């Protein structure tokens, strides 16, 4: 499932963790929102997962649906986020309708 994915990477290895001297844990899986890693803040444990990234100057917001657990090739569905800040935050909001705050 996903609880079984989490516990096996919480301890017993998430092989992309950085243990900071602060005791903090950082998932470097390029698709996580918080650079830190915690339960449903890292993109492997969670099944519904949104993120903003940049490939060029174009800032896309990637989105991961549990529908696509079978196929990892097309996991992250992505949408361009205009360029003006105000309309982009509004653009963000509509995609995040009926999700976690």
């Amino acid at each position: 499932s996903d609880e079984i994915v989490w516990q096996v990477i919480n301890q017993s290895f998430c092989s992309h963790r950085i243990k900071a001297p602060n005791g903090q844990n950082f998932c470097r899986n390029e698709y996580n929102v918080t650079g830190l890693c915690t339960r449903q803040s890292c993109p492997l444990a969670n099944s519904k997962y949104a993120t903003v990234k940049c490939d060029n100057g174009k800032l896309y917001l990637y989105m991961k649906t549990p529908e696509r657990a079978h196929t990892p090739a097309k996991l992250w569905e992505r949408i361009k986020l205009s360029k003006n800040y105000t309309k982009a935050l509004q653009q963000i909001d509509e995609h995040l309708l009926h999700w976690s705050k």
């Binding site: 499932s1 649906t65 549990p66 529908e67 696509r68 079978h70």
Partner: protein, 220 residues
């Protein structure tokens, strides 16, 4: 078969499998018997929703999975004090298996796809519900159909059914009752079932108190 075409990993053969199931449901001369074939059909339709993730196509898919109670045995034949004549006889076998599928499935649905099956079971209860028949009265359809709702999904004298689906039916059957559009219908006998559940001891408090507040507290 259709259990390999509705449970495919390809989107196009699942849409085309739904359309060939539309032609297969308007080909009524082959769907005469064999309950477990209808059970396999609802398991294939269960997976056919299970691979759909995006919200607009899963609402279109829920609306057309409800509509499959409409293409299969449309009302046009519109039988006269005719008991169960090839639009109402086999239809009940297409209903029960669906609930049986959900009676098999309520453990195995995760916390992210369970909204698809709450919304799906809303549309399908509305659609069987809409096909009592085109009018809301057909009397042996009411008591035989209510026997093949009562005897499986709100049993509530058996723990084999999962307790989240009767409380969800309690949450939906009023608004989805009056999606049919103050009239008088066989509603109260349905409500008598819930009164039977309040009459039934040897159960858990949730069925007893959650219908006893949620269903009976409605002023409608």
């Amino acid at each position: 078969n259709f259990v390999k075409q509705l449970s495919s990993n390809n989107r196009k053969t699942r849409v085309n499998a739904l359309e060939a199931l539309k032609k297969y449901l308007t080909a009524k001369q082959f769907k005469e018997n064999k309950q477990i074939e209808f059970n396999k059909l609802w398991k294939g339709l269960y997976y056919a929703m299970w691979f759909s993730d995006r919200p607009r196509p899963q609402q279109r898919l829920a609306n057309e999975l409800g509509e499959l109670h409409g293409l299969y045995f449309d009302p046009k034949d519109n039988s006269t004090a005719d008991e169960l004549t090839t639009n109402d006889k086999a239809f009940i076998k297409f209903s029960r298996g669906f609930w049986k599928v959900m009676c098999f499935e309520w453990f195995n649905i995760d916390r992210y796809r369970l909204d698809k099956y709450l919304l799906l079971i809303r549309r399908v209860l509305f659609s069987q519900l809409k096909y009592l028949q085109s009018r809301n009265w057909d009397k042996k359809l009411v008591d035989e159909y209510i026997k093949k709702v009562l005897r499986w999904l709100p049993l509530s004298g058996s723990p084999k059914v999962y307790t989240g689906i009767p409380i969800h039916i309690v949450d939906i059957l009023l608004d989805e009752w009056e999606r049919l559009l103050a009239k008088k219908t066989p509603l109260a006998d349905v409500i008598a079932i819930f009164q039977d559940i309040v009459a039934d001891y040897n159960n858990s408090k949730v069925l007893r108190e959650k219908i006893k507040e949620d269903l009976f507290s409605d002023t409608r």
